[PDB]
RNA sequence: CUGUUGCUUAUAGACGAUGGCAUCAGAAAUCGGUGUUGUAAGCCUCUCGGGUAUUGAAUG
RNA sequence: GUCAUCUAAUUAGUGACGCGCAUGAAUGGAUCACCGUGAUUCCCACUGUCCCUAUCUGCAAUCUAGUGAAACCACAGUCAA
RNA sequence: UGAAACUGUCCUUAGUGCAGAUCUUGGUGGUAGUAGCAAAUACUAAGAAGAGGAAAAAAACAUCUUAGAACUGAAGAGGAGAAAGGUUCCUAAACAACAUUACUUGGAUUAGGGUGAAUCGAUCCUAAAUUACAGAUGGAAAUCCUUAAGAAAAGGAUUGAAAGGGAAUAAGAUUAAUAGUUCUUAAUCAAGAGAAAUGGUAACAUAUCAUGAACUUUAAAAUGGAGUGUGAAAAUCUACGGAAGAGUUCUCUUUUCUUCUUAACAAAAGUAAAUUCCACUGAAAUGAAUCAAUCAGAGAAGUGGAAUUUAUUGGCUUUGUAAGAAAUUCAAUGAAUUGUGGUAUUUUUGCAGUCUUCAUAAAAAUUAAAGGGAAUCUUUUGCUCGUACUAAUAACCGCAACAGGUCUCCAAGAAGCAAAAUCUUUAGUUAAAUAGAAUAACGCAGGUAAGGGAAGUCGGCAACAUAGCUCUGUAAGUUAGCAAGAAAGAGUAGCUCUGGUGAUCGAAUCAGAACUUUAAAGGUUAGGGG
RNA sequence: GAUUCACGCAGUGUUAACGUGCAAAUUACUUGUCAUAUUUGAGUAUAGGGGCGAAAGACUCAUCGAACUAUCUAGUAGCUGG
């Protein structure tokens, strides 16, 4: 006998594919009489039809690769296949820096460290690529504040 | 896989009567795993127990 | 590619069934029938088509009313 | 197509109805020569062209 | 007597053919010799280790 | 075509010469940067293209079971004169 | 042999004699049991059913289940549609023919069954265009005109889109097969029935409220593309805390894996991003701000407000629906659970400004508002038609189960700049013009090779070769833009560390230093140069 | 109307395969191209001394230096065959 109908109906009832349907190989005559979805539901209850577990796929190798890359184990020149701008965009570096530096100047003016006149000049200096990072801007502000206070 | 098979395989094949027709026999080849193949020769396995 | 390949895109009907003559001869874009000469009031017949005249003419059908009038 | 006109569907149904063979009792009539319907077709053999 | 057949047969070979043996036959593992690679797995040392080795290799 | 150059060797290539069978100015003449699945010549590198072939794999071809066409066909099918 | 018509002689009459016409039609040979049934990686074991794996190996055996081993690799050999087909859909019986062997299989034979809508479409509107009455034209057939010619149509007729516009439905379950269509629950829409208001300075706001005719106007439906930034959702990845189940386990692994969900339509605890307006004040020592810009006395910034957009009400969390569903487990129908986050990537969907055009990138049905001031909650109904199936290495077009052709939707992990090549998960499949033995020549496809290195050849044809990334360096010529990745040179692995780049814990990226080795892009991918 | 890779598409070479083929034009590799003079569906418009053509006498249903189909038509043949 052929259990093609039972495999198709069981996959619909169990909401899986035909590849996950397990029909009991010793109870073939019992399953053969299950020609309806209602009968298939009874067989599933009696464990004559079982949904196979999904194929195991682990991420252990990927996790250890990323942790090694965090320490820099595979970030060498022989492991880079994309250009410098492709790996780390040059535009997003600029966008991050302007948000970072404009945030700091905004905080200094609001708190009263710098007035609007000194804020305005530093805003244009920052825009003109004068400071590489946050620290370089802080020292220049403090250097200018001391010069003004003299 | 389909491309590689073990160089040496130890098998045990027994001849038993066919249940249906008594005159005929049939051979059942089964696989016996071994730790190593050193000093293993052809034998005859006999139960000889109650 | 003018042979086997170019025939793959043939899935748009030039002609559908005609209401007056029943043949798949109604040109959709021309809006007329190539066989019976539809909306034209007169049925389309030509003297060079002598076979087409004996395929659809008087007596080739049921003759529902005329079979009684003539015999009367 | 799934989408079709009503009268076109009825002409499709008629072509299904006409794709049938001679009934058995008709074949047992005296002086009968009609055993197989020669106006028969199948979807994969001849396209009915409508 | 010859042929078939068997040794999933070779000193032979597309198939035939040809050559050998056919119960003191043949086949098989195992062991030894002989080679190749390079020092196995558990705990630099075990370690000239481990693995392979007729399949068209040679003994028993 | 003649003279140079390219090679050991040049009916090929390039640079000159020009009474040019029969070049020539929107029949457009000359010029050429960049570009070209365009044409041509020479270098470097590389290699079975070659010296000169050897060898490895898969699928066929061989044989067998099942299945099974076509082209062609006067009759046919050894040579010398 | 054959079983019902026929013959001889004389005249008359002719569709009157075949070896040829590449003659016409039909039938049949040799070739010949020959060429072939060789693209699409691939099958094996046990069992069942069946007449159909027998046997001195006749070395191969179709269908179904299970186990193993595998392929397509999520721009698929996955899940669905448009056209086209037309019952091929589902089931049962049955296998004469058909699918280049066979078939118990089938898109094949026979007989039954199957397509359910107020909300999806057609129907409705118009686009390019198309066609009428009257009129104009023509010998005629007929052509022209489509609002101009008209005693026709307040203004102009018909048709034209299952991708354009458009009133309104979702979740779960269910069937051998249909399901935004059936059932349960919960909604929505249309058409019906039962002297005319307030608040706010303002922008504007009030579960119908709070009248609003003719006429007119405005807006919507309804409008290119590029590129940048960014809000939200989903998927993927990940942090914290677990609950339940499964995998490995004599070697370890507080371990690896799986589930932890929720609709339409509404509500309004809490809380966003962007833009545009309003009130106060009036900016020069000019300020404000963006990745970029851009803006300001026809009024900036600041403070306080109003509105709209963000895949239904109002964007997100949350709430009703609603856990009673569903998912994952356990017991033999009954019980358990169903937190909180992320300055990560991609897709989708909006938004904001920038750029570009000798290109400026539909209309109508239909809807709302305004100006004007004429007049004085419950319940009913919702018609017609399509709806099955394939949508393609077998349902379509090519004579066919043809390696050809044919418009779309959704879209996991690794690795990488990459939707590249390669491998895998969910799903699908292991059959897709037959195989077994042998391992000749000559082939087709893929390779390698001593020494030499184009001497081969019409010709470096074919093949080899170069190839990613970083740093240094880069000539003549030039339309000054390029040539340019010119050319040329050095570096690159593994392990253990350090430093730089932020916010009030996190991102992969860059630089440097020890030590070790078979001294490192090269498995795949990947310029030869002058 | 810059350079490239990918999904797709084409057709430079092998003058490879096949050439009674998978195919009355396809397959493999190499190569080229791969969004604005781009690609593509459906609707629609243009018809045979005509259409359409970034122009090859190209394309107009395997038919094009004048389509297909039917009639005149059993066209005529000093030429070939019987």
Automatic annotation (TrEMBL), chain A:
Which residue ranges does the record assign to the Large ribosomal subunit protein eL19 domain?
2-145
Q: Does the keyword Metal-binding apply?
A: no
**Can the keyword Ribosomal protein be found in this entry's annotation?**
yes
**What GO biological process term is on the record, naming one?**
translation
- Entry keyword set: Ribonucleoprotein, Ribosomal protein
What start-end ranges are recorded for coiled-coil regions in this protein? none
Please give an example of a GO cellular component term from this record: cytosolic large ribosomal subunit
| Molecular function GO terms recorded | RNA binding; structural constituent of ribosome
- Spell out the family assignment given in the record's similarity comment: Belongs to the eukaryotic ribosomal protein eL19 family.
Name of protein? Ribosomal protein L19
Species of origin: Entamoeba histolytica (strain ATCC 30459 / HM-1:IMSS / ABRM)
Q: Which region of the full protein is contained in this chain?
A: 2 to 151 of 198
TrEMBL record, chain B:
Instruction: Name the family the entry cites.
Output: Belongs to the eukaryotic ribosomal protein eL31 family.
Q: What is this protein called?
A: 60S ribosomal protein L31, putative
Automatic annotation (TrEMBL), chain C:
The residue range of the signal peptide is none
- Superkingdom field: Eukaryota
Q: Give the record's GO biological process terms.
A: translation
**UniProt keyword annotation of Transmembrane present:** no
* SUPFAM superfamilies linked to this entry: Zn-binding ribosomal proteins
Cellular component (GO) terms are: cytosolic large ribosomal subunit
* Disulfide bond listed as a keyword: no
Pfam families reported for this sequence = Ribosomal_L37e
Molecular function in Gene Ontology? RNA binding; rRNA binding; structural constituent of ribosome; zinc ion binding
Q: Which InterPro entries match?
A: Ribosomal_eL37, Ribosomal_eL37/eL43, Ribosomal_zn-bd
The UniProt keywords, alphabetically, are: Metal-binding, Ribonucleoprotein, Ribosomal protein, RNA-binding, rRNA-binding, Zinc, Zinc-finger
Q: Which PANTHER family match?
A: 60S RIBOSOMAL PROTEIN L37, RIBOSOMAL PROTEIN L37
Similarity annotation: Belongs to the eukaryotic ribosomal protein eL37 family.
Protein name in the entry: 60S ribosomal protein L37-A, putative
TrEMBL record, chain D:
Q: What species does this protein belong to?
A: Entamoeba histolytica (strain ATCC 30459 / HM-1:IMSS / ABRM)
Q: Name the InterPro entries for this protein.
A: Ribosomal_eL39 (IPR000077), Ribosomal_eL39_dom_sf (IPR023626)
Q: Name the GO terms of the biological process aspect.
A: translation
Q: Which GO terms describe its cellular component?
A: cytosolic large ribosomal subunit
* Protein name as annotated: Ribosomal protein L39, putative
Q: Which Pfam families match?
A: Ribosomal_L39 (PF00832)
Of which family is this protein a member?
Belongs to the eukaryotic ribosomal protein eL39 family.
Cite a single GO MF annotation.
Answer: structural constituent of ribosome
Keywords annotated in UniProt: Ribonucleoprotein, Ribosomal protein
């Amino acid at each position: 006998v052929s259990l093609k109908l039972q495999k198709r109906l069981a996959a619909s009832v169990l909401k899986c594919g035909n590849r996950k349907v397990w029909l009991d190989p010793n109870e073939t005559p019992e399953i053969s009489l299950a020609n309806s979805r209602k009968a298939i539901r009874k067989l599933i209850k009696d464990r004559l039809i079982i949904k196979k577990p999904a194929a195991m796929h682990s991420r252990a190798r990927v996790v250890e690769r990323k942790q090694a890359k965090i320490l820099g184990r595979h970030t060498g020149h022989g492991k880079r296949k994309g250009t410098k701008n492709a790996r780390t965009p040059q535009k997003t570096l600029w966008i991050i820096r302007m948000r970072v530096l404009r945030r700091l100047l905004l905080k200094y003016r609001t708190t009263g460290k710098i007035d609007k006149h000194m804020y305005h000049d530093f805003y244009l200096k920052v825009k003109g690529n004068q400071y590489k990072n946050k620290k370089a801007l802080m020292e220049s502000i403090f250097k200018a504040l001391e010069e003004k206070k003299l | 896989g389909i491309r590689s098979v073990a160089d040496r395989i130890r098998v045990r094949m027994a001849r038993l009567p066919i249940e249906g027709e008594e005159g005929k026999f049939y051979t059942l080849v089964s696989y016996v795993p071994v730790a190593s193949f050193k000093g293993l020769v052809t034998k005859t396995v006999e139960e000889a127990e109650n | 590619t003018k042979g086997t390949s170019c025939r793959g895109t043939r899935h748009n009907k030039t002609h559908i069934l005609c209401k007056r003559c029943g043949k798949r001869s109604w040109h959709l874009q021309k809006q007329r029938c190539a066989s019976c000469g539809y909306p034209d009031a007169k049925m389309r017949q030509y003297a060079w088509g002598y076979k087409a005249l004996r395929r659809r003419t008087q007596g080739t059908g049921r003759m529902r009313h005329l079979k009684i009038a003539l015999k009367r | 197509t799934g989408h079709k006109g009503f009268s076109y569907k009825l002409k499709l149904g008629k072509k299904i109805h006409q794709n049938r063979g001679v009934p058995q009792w008709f074949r047992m009539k005296t002086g009968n020569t009609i055993n197989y319907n020669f106006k028969r077709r199948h979807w994969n053999r001849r396209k009915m062209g409508m």
